[PDB]
Amino acid sequence: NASSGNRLILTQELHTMLQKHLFPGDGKEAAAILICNRYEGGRLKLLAKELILVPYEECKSRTSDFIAWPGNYLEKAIDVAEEKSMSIILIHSHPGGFLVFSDTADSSDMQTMQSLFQGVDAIHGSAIMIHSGEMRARLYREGKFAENVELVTVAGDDIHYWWDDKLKPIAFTSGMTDTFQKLTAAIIGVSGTGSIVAEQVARLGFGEILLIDHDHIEKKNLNRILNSTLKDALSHRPKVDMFAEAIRCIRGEDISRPINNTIFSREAVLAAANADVLFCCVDTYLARMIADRIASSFLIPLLDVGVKIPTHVDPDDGRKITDVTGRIDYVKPGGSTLSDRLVYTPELIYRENLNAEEYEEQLERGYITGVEEEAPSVITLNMRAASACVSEFIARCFPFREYPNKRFTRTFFSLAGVEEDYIDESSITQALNTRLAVGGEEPLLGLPELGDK
């Protein structure tokens, strides 16, 4: 139901810049222009890419209820958006009244929206911001008002959802469910951890749940996969089909969307790109890499979770558990990526995708290092990690902690070491992310394998 409402996503950095320009302190209206890419999937997603600020000095009038700014900046925006038919969104301070003057004519808001369409054959919009940051937007189709943006959102250290139909609801409350009911969650990997994440997402009330996985239930994984059964293992049932049916039975509605495929596929990516949050629960580097590319290209907050039980072998006792650890990583669009945090690397992905004979011969040559041996995964550790992963999302949508959510960008706990650590977003080094808000620019995700013909 609430799974096709259009979206307008800004990055934290861009929104912070916009808010500053729109509320400099003089109490007068200011103007700016967003240039957005689009993903026209199940729902329309406007992905803010470029920001033009209209300098106060160039404006002919600036008042607490009105502003008049020159159309040379509307021509700059059209020039930026002409090549890719990008969407242009005008932004103005809370009152919002404005005109656009040329040297020969003035343009009302409705006439300025007609001018944008004549310049670019695409959807365009007009938004308004209030002092606190909240935004509301109206989409104009074919130069004439049409629909309002159902959701304008910024996924920053805190996650912001500004609904059209709109104190803040506290956590674990009805208002929380109502926010989740309008959202779509993607679970990449319906695994030991993934199936626990999926269960929580279902019972928490999310409106749409994508399940991406190629694997099947087996007698081996009947000790970890929630809602799996002996019958499913003996019939080698796809994991997504199994869990899609369980959600339907639990929620009494077909909210699940099973994707029987690897995340590394056009089908899974283009489906995951519709989600409002990504839960990466695959234990491969390549999978974590694909999930991190989706998050930046389609401005989707990503939560990546991992667990590991490394084992050694003592000559006096025998095989021993070295450590019992877990990791939760939250990745906001524009902030540090999983690549920045070295969750995966080119070297790490190479060794993994080597053949069985390729891996051994390279290992003999000493160019590649050997993989670390580990114990069998256990349901308890998976459960400890998956509960923290989903709790991280709640804390960022409905802050309840005694410290800024930024302090817990990365989390590393240890059941054996009985120790838990946290890393701040500000202590992680970020590399240039030119692929931010590019959407489905081909080749998809920048990978020629995922490209169209």
């Binding site: 590394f264 890499m289 070297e347 992905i349 990978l447 020629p448």
Partner: protein, 128 residues
């Protein structure tokens, strides 16, 4: 040979065309092979042209291109073997010489282009 079983990056493809190479992209099983035909070598090898090949790994260009391959196998004209060039790899029933040459990979800058640049730099090095 205009075989094009898969696409590379658009920048990779613009480069190979600008360089005038006769290049093909061939699927062999699940191995993606880029093959440049009649690659002119520097003087000093038993042969003067070879087929220069790169294995396009899964996840490229975030996954790394690790080595380069050459057929017919190459040896210095004086006969002395080239270090770390003993292994061979079947490419559509052709035994290519695998040059074991490794570097650091940076997805922001590394592509077919720079890996072809390494390959040339290594070929210049082993005759001089």
């Amino acid at each position: 040979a205009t075989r094009r079983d898969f696409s590379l990056r658009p920048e990779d493809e613009h480069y190979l065309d600008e360089m005038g190479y006769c290049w093909e992209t061939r699927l062999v099983g699940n191995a993606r092979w880029l093959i440049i035909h009649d690659y002119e070598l520097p003087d000093g090898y038993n042969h003067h042209q070879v087929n220069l090949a790169l294995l396009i790994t899964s996840g490229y260009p975030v996954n790394m291109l690790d080595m380069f391959y050459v057929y017919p196998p190459l040896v210095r004209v004086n006969g002395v073997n080239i270090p770390a060039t003993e292994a061979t790899v079947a490419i559509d029933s052709v035994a290519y010489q695998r040059w074991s040459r490794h570097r650091s990979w940076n997805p922001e800058i590394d592509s077919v282009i720079s890996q072809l640049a390494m390959a040339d730099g290594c070929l210049q090095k082993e005759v001089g």
